[PDB]
Amino acid sequence: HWGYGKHNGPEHWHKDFPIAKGERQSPVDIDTHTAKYDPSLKPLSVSYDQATSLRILNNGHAFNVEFDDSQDKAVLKGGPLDGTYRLIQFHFHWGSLDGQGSEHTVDKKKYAAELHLVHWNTKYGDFGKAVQQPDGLAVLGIFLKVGSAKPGLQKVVDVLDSIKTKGKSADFTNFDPRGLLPESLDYWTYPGSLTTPPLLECVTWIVLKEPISVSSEQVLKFRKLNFNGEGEPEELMVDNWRPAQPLKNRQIKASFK
């Protein structure tokens, strides 16, 4: 019964998920002056041409676009990663207002939203095993700012009426996640966690420097979703973001100078 309200939001999660106060929690503030350029980092390899999207779900905290991860169809490699990571789902976090919504921050700047493309390390066989491992997941984070529309986001926007409330799902085949990427794949990377319970410390974070632009109309539709189930008092799905956590004994590395 965790969520994002006053009574069950991020400040409460530690009572059921004590790892909330752990040593490698996410998100974090990215201090761009402190992040060290690491020339040993590789270019990211994003191989999404054969992606197979299947369904979109309102899970009560966000909406997830789910993929067929039973073969190496949509994978992330290179960068800081050893081995092959398969795309399982993407989702977003966003605000009630354009001046907040991202989970990571940059020099304390909050973006209007953040996209997370979630991948699991194939050496562990399944997502549920991978989350038990320190190198089990790689999450590609992409900031959203409000300006011009993102054409590749519009299919997502237009299906949201069909999944307004918690527990609703809809067919969502033939979606190309390449349409959500910025032009540049320059990134920061650091070891961290899931940003929702169970907050497991299993993620290599790869946060792209270049934000994507979406329109005010696009993000407005996100904010008309509901946390609640059908027939229950309406609770708009907004401010479903965890704030920055202590960096502790971690280094953020930059792929670029």
Ligand SMILES: NCCc1ccc(S(N)(=O)=O)cc1
């Ligand atoms: N729903 C109110 C009671 C309640 C509040 C907080 C949590 S936690 N620690 O999981 O965030 C569970 C239950």
Ligand SMILES: NCCc1ccc(S(N)(=O)=O)cc1
């Ligand atoms: N093989 C696992 C398939 C799969 C399971 C769950 C989800 S989600 N995004 O709703 O957590 C997506 C894909």
Ligand SMILES: NCCc1ccc(S(N)(=O)=O)cc1
């Ligand atoms: N719901 C599946 C588990 C889970 C997957 C990804 C994330 S995040 N926000 O860190 O990309 C949190 C939890």
Ligand SMILES: [Zn+2]
């Ligand atoms: Zn997320």
